[PDB]
């Protein structure tokens, strides 16, 4: 139904339940005027470290800002649809490998790993945009990036920083922290 999987293979049961909840929600509500062409790409269910879980919902690139136009309502509708598990919106971006002399179109820099990871981090939280990134390198050589979020709309996304760190460690693979500074604004 709502599943548009990029390869013609079998959608998962929890992803099918997500799509069924989305289609039932767009029938029972008035949002169907802005949900006729918007489609889910894929979904995943990971284990956030502790007693909580999270839902990752995959979004096509040219329909991203259509989901950002109504991102405020569907997160609380999926919170009241489920029990206590948080939900995020992450766009689906293809990652192209770095060319080598051992191995043709020129690879665009929007498909690079750094740009894809930065776009995933910026699209990870919508209501609070990033107003600064600091990278802490510890004495063992590992990287630990701390992310500053804006003062406006803080209490909506204050309790989700652990889930954001968990899903960013699962999708990307490096540790991230979040902070709300009080210096500028």
């Amino acid at each position: 139904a709502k599943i548009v999987k990029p390869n013609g293979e079998k959608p998962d049961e929890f992803e099918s339940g997500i799509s069924q909840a989305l289609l039932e929600l767009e029938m029972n509500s008035d949002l169907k005027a802005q949900l006729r062409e918007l489609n889910i790409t894929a979904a995943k269910e990971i284990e956030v470290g502790g007693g909580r879980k999270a839902i990752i919902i995959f979004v096509p690139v040219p329909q991203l800002k259509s989901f950002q136009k109504i991102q405020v309502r569907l997160v609380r509708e999926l919170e009241k649809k489920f029990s206590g598990k948080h939900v995020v919106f992450i766009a689906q971006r293809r990652i192209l490998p770095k060319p080598t002399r051992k191995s043709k179109q020129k690879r665009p820099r929007s498909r690079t790993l750094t740009a894809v990871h930065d776009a995933i981090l910026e699209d990870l939280v919508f209501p609070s945009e990033i107003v600064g990134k600091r990278i802490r390198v510890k004495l063992d050589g590992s990287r630990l990036i701390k992310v500053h979020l804006d003062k406006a709309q803080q209490n909506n996304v204050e309790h989700k920083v652990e889930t954001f760190s968990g899903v960013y460690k699962k999708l990307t693979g490096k540790d991230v922290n979040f902070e709300f500074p009080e210096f500028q604004l």
Binding site: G132, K133, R134, I135, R136, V137, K138, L139, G141
Partner: protein, 129 residues
Amino acid sequence: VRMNVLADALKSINNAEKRGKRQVLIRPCSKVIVRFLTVMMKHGYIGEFEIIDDHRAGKIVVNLTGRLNKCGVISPRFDVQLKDLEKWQNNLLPSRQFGFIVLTTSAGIMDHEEARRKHTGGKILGFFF
């Protein structure tokens, strides 16, 4: 104009080390500067530093400790072989018990002892002791 960013970074680090400051602000960063600072971290000469990420070119704030004597950069990048490294050891280091030469090999930016261990050579970058 600004032509060697790494030489400027190690010059500012050495100047603030001789002055006695505890934090150094390098305005332009590079990947080479990150690898050089990682080597200086792993051999225990500098402390725990940062990357100030803006959208043009990042800044680096280095927490200093009083273990650094001098940081220098050999310009230009002279190609050195494995039999020519000992010449640099005698005319660049103050002693044989300590002192390190950072050189750019194909296996990555590393010191001279790991370069002798992996049996490879490359281009010169600098030195610290």
